[PDB]
Design a protein around this ligand. Structure first.
Ligand SMILES: CC(=O)SCCNC(=O)CCNC(=O)[C@H](O)C(C)(C)COP(=O)(O)OP(=O)(O)OC[C@H]1O[C@@H](n2cnc3c(N)ncnc32)[C@H](O)[C@@H]1OP(=O)(O)O
Length: 162
């Protein structure tokens, strides 16, 4: 079981994996326009960390976008395939992601969660109250009046994915 950052480098291997991830996202986030998922997963600003089983099968992942100078990242999509849920993978994935963000010098994660997903994020340390001022991400991350913007601080010397 590996947690690798997938790069859209135009190779058959990585491309297949990103498509596989994309299909998991659309399956688990049914109300999300599939063409939109495709757009973000394959654009040049987004990266995806996948849960790789047997070094070939994608069973879940997180698609995110780093705003490097600002030191924050938005979690665009997150999911574990249905037949692999409730096995601790979702949590292991987030811990691996936080460890990576810490190494990438990212200070905060932001994500718009679906009412049903809010609980998962709260479990991972995300909160509805923000320690980061609105002015800071405004202009980089879209401000939707109809979703719940959640935030998670990534401490520079806390041991994640331990
Ligand atoms: C921006 C984002 O995309 S928002 C949408 C997030 N994605 C989804 O909702 C997609 C559908 N869901 C999924 O793909 C999965 O259920 C995930 C990623 C939410 C969680 O993955 P799993 O492999 O099942 O996670 P894992 O088993 O490690 O979770 C363990 C803990 O998370 C909690 N948890 C997981 N899913 C949920 C949920 N939907 N609601 C509430 N709590 C949840 C478990 O209750 C558990 O609590 P515990 O450790 O005290 O027992």
């Amino acid at each position: 079981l590996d947690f690798d950052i997938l790069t859209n480098d135009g190779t058959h291997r990585n491309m297949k994996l990103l498509i596989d991830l994309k299909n998991i996202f659309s399956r688990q986030l049914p109300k999300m326009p599939k063409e939109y998922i495709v757009k973000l997963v394959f654009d040049r600003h987004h990266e995806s960390m996948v849960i790789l089983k047997n070094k070939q099968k994608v069973i879940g992942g997180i698609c995110f976008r780093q705003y490097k100078p600002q030191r924050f990242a938005e979690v665009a999509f997150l999911a574990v395939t249905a037949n692999e849920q409730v096995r601790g993978y979702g949590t292991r994935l987030m811990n691996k992601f936080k460890d990576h963000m810490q190494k990438q010098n990212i200070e905060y994660l932001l994500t718009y969660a679906d009412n049903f997903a809010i609980g998962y994020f709260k479990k991972q340390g995300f909160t509805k109250e923000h320690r980061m001022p609105q002015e800071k991400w405004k202009g980089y991350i879209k401000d939707y009046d109809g979703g719940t913007l959640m935030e998670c601080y990534i401490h520079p010397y806390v041991d994640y994915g331990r």
